[PDB]
Amino acid sequence: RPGGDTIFGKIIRKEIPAKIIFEDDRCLAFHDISPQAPTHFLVIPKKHISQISVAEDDDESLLGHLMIVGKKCAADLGLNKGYRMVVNEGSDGGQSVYHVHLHVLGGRQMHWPPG
Amino acid sequence: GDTIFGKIIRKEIPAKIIFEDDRCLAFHDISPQAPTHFLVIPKKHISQISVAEDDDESLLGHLMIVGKKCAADLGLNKGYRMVVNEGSDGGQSVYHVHLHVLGGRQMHWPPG
Numbered sequence: 290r291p292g293g294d295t296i297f298g299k300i301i302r303k304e305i306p307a308k309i310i311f312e313d314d315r316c317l318a319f320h321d322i323s324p325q326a327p328t329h330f331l332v333i334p335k336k337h338i339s340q341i342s343v344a345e346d347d348d349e350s351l352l353g354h355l356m357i358v359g360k361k362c363a364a365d366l367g368l369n370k371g372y373r374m375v376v377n378e379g380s381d382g383g384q385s386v387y388h389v390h391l392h393v394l395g396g397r398q399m400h401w402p403p404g
Numbered sequence: 405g406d407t408i409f410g411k412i413i414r415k416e417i418p419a420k421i422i423f424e425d426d427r428c429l430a431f432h433d434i435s436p437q438a439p440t441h442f443l444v445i446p447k448k449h450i451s452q453i454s455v456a457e458d459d460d461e462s463l464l465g466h467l468m469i470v471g472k473k474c475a476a477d478l479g480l481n482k483g484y485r486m487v488v489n490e491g492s493d494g495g496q497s498v499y500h501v502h503l504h505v506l507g508g509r510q511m512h513w514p515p516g
């Protein structure tokens with residue numbers, strides 16, 4: 290199936306509902322169901338890449354597109370005071386859904402260290 | 405650019421450099437928040453991700469691929485976290501866009 294076998298595949302195929310912010314041929318942006326900030330959404334590729342560590346050289350433009358869409362969506366959602374983008378990789382990264390995605394968090398002061 | 409990261413790119417002040425090519429530089433953070441903590445920055449002075457243009461797509465993806473490759477080269481095979489800070493709320497410390505890569509310990513949630 291298009292979108293892979295994770296829960297994010299079900300969202301892409303619209304088998305389960307999501308609060309979608311943006312969609313195109315390459316990616317999908319939607320709100321996180323467990324927000325860690327007043328605004329918290331994800332940007333994901335429609336292509337199933339399990340994690341960033343296995344991305345190929347030819348995935349470069351796709352990954353950049355995730356960041357560009359993340360920035361545009363943040364602007365659209367009025368995060369003019371700033372925001373934080375996050376990618377969790379693997380065990381130490383805290384990854385739980387193995388479909389590459391970018392978090393965008395805003396609407397409050399983010400702290401250092403980032404976890 | 406007129407930031408400390410510009411000086412580092414120009415080799416005017418030292419940094420522990422990990423990788424370089426014609427369009428980016430990776431180097432260890434001087435104030436590390438994890439056993440491994442480094443930065444990947446473009447040589448193009450983009451002040452912050454919110455001002456990146458569509459034409460910068462390839463370059464931004466390049467930062468992430470270089471980050472991935474450097475993480476592997478530094479032995480972060482148990483995982484890591486990538487971070488880009490924007491503006492005041494994002495805690496952006498230098499107005500030259502930079503990609504953080506942190507690992508060598510469990511990263512926690514929320515990410516700040």
Ligand SMILES: O=c1[nH]cnc2c1ncn2[C@@H]1O[C@H](COP(=O)(O)O)[C@@H](O)[C@H]1O
Pocket residue numbers: 296307320321322323324331377382383384385386387
């Ligand atoms: O069905 C969903 N809709 C929206 N967000 C989700 C869903 N399932 C998991 N997530 C989020 O996806 C992230 C997965 O964790 P991560 O792999 O560490 O980024 C968490 O922020 C979850 O709350």
